[PDB]
Design a protein that fits this description.
This is part of a larger assembly, with 2 copies of chain A, 3 copies of chain C and 1 copy of chain F. Chain A is mainly α. Chain A has 2 helices and no strands. Chain C is an alpha+beta fold. In chain C, strands 1, 2, 3, 4, 5, 6, 7, 8, 9 and 10 form a 10-stranded antiparallel beta sheet that branches. The termini of chain C are far apart. In chain F, the strands form 2 sheets. A two-stranded antiparallel sheet of chain F has the order 1-2. A two-stranded parallel ribbon of chain F has the order 3-4. In chain F, α3 packs antiparallel against α7 and α7 runs antiparallel to α8. Chain F is globular. Chain F starts with a helix and ends in a 19-residue tail after the last helix. The chains are: A mainly alpha, C alpha+beta, F mainly alpha. Chains in contact: A-B, A-C, C-D, C-E, D-E, D-F. The interface between C and D is medium-sized, with 32 and 32 residues. Chain A: This is Vp2. Chain F: InterPro entries: Seadorna_Vp10. Chain F: This is VP10.
Amino acid sequence: DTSFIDTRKYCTDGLSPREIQKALNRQRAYYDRPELTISENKTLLSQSII
Amino acid sequence: FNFSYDIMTTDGVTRLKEDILIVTDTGNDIKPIHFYIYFENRNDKKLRYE
Amino acid sequence: ANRATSAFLDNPHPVGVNYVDEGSRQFVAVAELLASKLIDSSRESDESNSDVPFVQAYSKFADDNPRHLRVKTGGKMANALTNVIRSYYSINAPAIVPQVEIDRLASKATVSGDMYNSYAIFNSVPIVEVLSPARTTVSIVGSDRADVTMLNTGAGAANITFNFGQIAETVILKGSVPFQLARLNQPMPAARFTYKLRPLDGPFIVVLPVGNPLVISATAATRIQVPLAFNKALVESGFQTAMNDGLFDIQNVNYYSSFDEFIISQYHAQDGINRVSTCVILGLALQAYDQMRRALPV
Amino acid sequence: ANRATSAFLDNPHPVGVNYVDEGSRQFVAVAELLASKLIDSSRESDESNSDVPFVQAYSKFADDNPRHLRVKTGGKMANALTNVIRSYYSINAPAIVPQVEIDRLASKATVSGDMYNSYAIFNSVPIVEVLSPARTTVSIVGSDRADVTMLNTGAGAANITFNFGQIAETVILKGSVPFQLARLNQPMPAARFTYKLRPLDGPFIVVLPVGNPLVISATAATRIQVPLAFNKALVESGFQTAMNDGLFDIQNVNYYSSFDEFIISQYHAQDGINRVSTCVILGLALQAYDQMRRALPV
Amino acid sequence: ANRATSAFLDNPHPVGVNYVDEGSRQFVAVAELLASKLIDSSRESDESNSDVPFVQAYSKFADDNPRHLRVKTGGKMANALTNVIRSYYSINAPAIVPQVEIDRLASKATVSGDMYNSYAIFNSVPIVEVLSPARTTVSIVGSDRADVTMLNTGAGAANITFNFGQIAETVILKGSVPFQLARLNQPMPAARFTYKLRPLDGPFIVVLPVGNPLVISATAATRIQVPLAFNKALVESGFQTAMNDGLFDIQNVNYYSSFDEFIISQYHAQDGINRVSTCVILGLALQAYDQMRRALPV
Amino acid sequence: MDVLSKGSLKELLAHLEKTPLEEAISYRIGTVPYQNVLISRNEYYNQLYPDTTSLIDGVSREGQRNVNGLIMSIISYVVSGSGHYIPNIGFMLLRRSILDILTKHDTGLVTNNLNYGIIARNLTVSKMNCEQRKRMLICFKLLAYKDGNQNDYEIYLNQNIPLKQIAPNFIPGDMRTVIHNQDQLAIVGIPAYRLTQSTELSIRDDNAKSYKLGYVDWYNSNSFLRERSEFNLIRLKDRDTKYGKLNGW
């Protein structure tokens, strides 16, 4: 990642966490809930690691 | 924080070249800082208004 | 006539009247939520062979980046949480923390702050008074389970009056030997081991025969409205940590063995309805203290 | 003078000195992690129509595929954990498991073997000694809550000395009737129901009048460094199980009602600081034994 | 029952309550770092025959380039450091320096203001009290090495009680002749030359024979949390220069021979934990004072 | 030297199988074991350097003619590289291997009365290092299994806490336990640190460094066997094999 704190290695194999994030945000749009926050996005985008 | 500035001999409105903040889903960042510094005449009403 | 009462019910000290507003109650809820993230992030960081998840969780909690050559005290949130805990316990404790800092720390999360959306059951046994005549001895020992030993030295049967208060919901009485118990102006039933009582029914009379002493074991249950995040196991652990750390060390206060004893004692005092509202907020704050201190020992 | 002491504090037996290295501590932590996943995978498979999550979890834990007609025992990890638990309890127990098996099983998961990143509170009351004069009777009953019943049949008041050791941090004293307690060679305060005492302060003198029996209830809190994964509820159930399947049956050892009593008793020995480190590793191993055996009963 | 106590433990005066915040702690740490470079540049300049390293070091410290016809005072930083040391010693000393000047000076260098990174061992012996009976004479001399001379003129052997407090970690007792020492109400051992004791173990009894004087030599070690840059040799030199310069001269303050005695005395007073924190900041400030004064002799 | 180079349990037991008892016994008179003596260490001091001689030195000493001396000579050979002076033992006993004496009843030697505590004290277990104590414990376990004294061996370990922690894990009758064992038992070897041609103060340390420096010379000598370059020239009987089993194990 571009963040200086994050030294983790983000795996590119498997289903992309970005695809789940896009699907989850569309679900929240239907229910009129606010979109995923930055903290929630970072946790979801860092699920796949090496 | 990296900053650059140009000092102009003429009078004018001191400002920044770019807007301060950029917001992304990943996080919030600060755009590059560049100053346009001018010398001041206190009795110039037009530049005081701006 | 002799009077015997539970030790923990004697002279409850007044509780604090500060940090009870809506914004302050949100800060306690935020602190509990963020402290629980610290513990989970520590266990996540151990399995992933990285310290990043703990670093981000600590940065959210303490508003400062961890450094290898600096102590991890917990930041401004840890200091504010410690001071509000002191203020709740006693009305004499100063309210050091300003209101602006409380509001800034409450903006980290989006919790509601409601303290009445759930319930918890407390097991402290309230025995307000035990009335015994002359020539009989009565002793009460215990809080979670109260054992009352009554001995009759005289030549006739003695009647002992039991008053469990009006707050407790149910009280279960078990005797070493079968005994007789009935309410005011009611016929005595046959002797039996176990009685289920409602404290609001009224004072109860136990027939005490002459001979070997009779011991009655009392267990009680009380319902108190608590937040959904309330966890009695964490609250009790946080209570002991706060007492050992000296957060409760202040003049003109009464100390208790457990948070269960503390909340029941205040609830049985006058204006105790308003007191338990403050005690419940203290309990949630103690939950945050236990989780934060276990993740960041000092 | 008559001396009375707590029963569980008498003669702690020496603990084992094996499997206390960093490689063996990693294996205990790995077993706890894999046992936790075994419980979770079984519940997920129960609530689904597929057994794949349980097959994968058991295969990693037991190094063998489950079979329908064969008992699921846990394989080599179960055998290693059972024998390692035996060694920790007593020095007389042999060290059967080779180091190669321990190192290989520790490689199944990635967890640090740190055993000092957190703390826990233990509730045993360490009454080392109670010294009473002649014509007085003192009886000590209980471990989690210690009740001392004292009677004075003498002509005058008697001074009783209470020693709570130097390990416990806070002791809370509650009495049936108000009583006087002060440190040695200090003026005696007014009679009151409750006392908060630091055991480091010194031996405590209690004035016992000649009128009626006085019962003092004691509760103590002591802090011991434990790994973050420590869960007191799971350890206590694991302690009760391991005693039932005979894992603690070995010559010339003591038996305790709870793990809280076991760890506090060893802490108060001459080498208590060295003993608690081994007992902490035993507690985590008991935590893994509880989860593993509940998922795979044999 | 005569009572004898150490001279330096008597009546520690209150310490200053200013310049102890996080911003002020950074100022002291920054001054120490900049003063250390000032003393290193002066040594380099003498050997290298070029004054460029010193000119750069002085410009950073004093914000003004050195001049040949002007005195090398040290600038605003030197004046600020001198006055902050005055405030630390006593609560009666005025706080001249404004917070704005402290913040401006602290921005010159970036250094963590943490004062709990490391530890230092202090060698003052805290003999709080020595209780002796009639017909015995006891004299205590010394702070670094406490020399207790006892002479018994009575008919039988006497018991002398030693109290070393609860702050010191270890105390080693050496006698001119073998002697007997045991804890309170504990069996006496055989006579021996050397005793290693833990002050928290309790007051100790010494059996004093009749006829020949017995001199007990006491040495102590105490651990106090200090910043990693703390150097005891430089702090002691700064302490004596500070006293000779006269900035410790305030009404109703106690004077001590060394910083070791000053910090132990404040530790043993009431609220000693809070006093020690200010003393550590004073020690680091005195360390910068010694280095800056030696580089620039004014 | 060769016995001190073995670093695994499999190699140590394999060497003992092929080594007769006469290698453990020394035919040099030596000196009496426990004496306070003054030795010369001119690299460090001008005055004579006090020391106490012992049985685990690298130099032969005089030994008692009883069975206790024979076992004590075997252990000293394993841990120090040299044995003691016990002559006229006999051809029948001397031709047997060291493992046969320690593990087999057919040798004709009776050792069930031996006391492990007295043997350890006479061998100065306090002066032994970690590898030396592990090697001696291997000898004790083999003797216990021969005499059916397994329970006594375990109790002796319980009395001595440091010995229990370092006790090697192997069943003296099963070869599968020996292969799995990963304890490092080497006393001499190729040194990772800087090893210099300098003397040591004590007799034990100076004699140990002689073997360490001798092993380096032995390693580069023509007598050393290089498995990587000359494996085909080794005889098949003594060639290294993965499925290597001691007889009866």
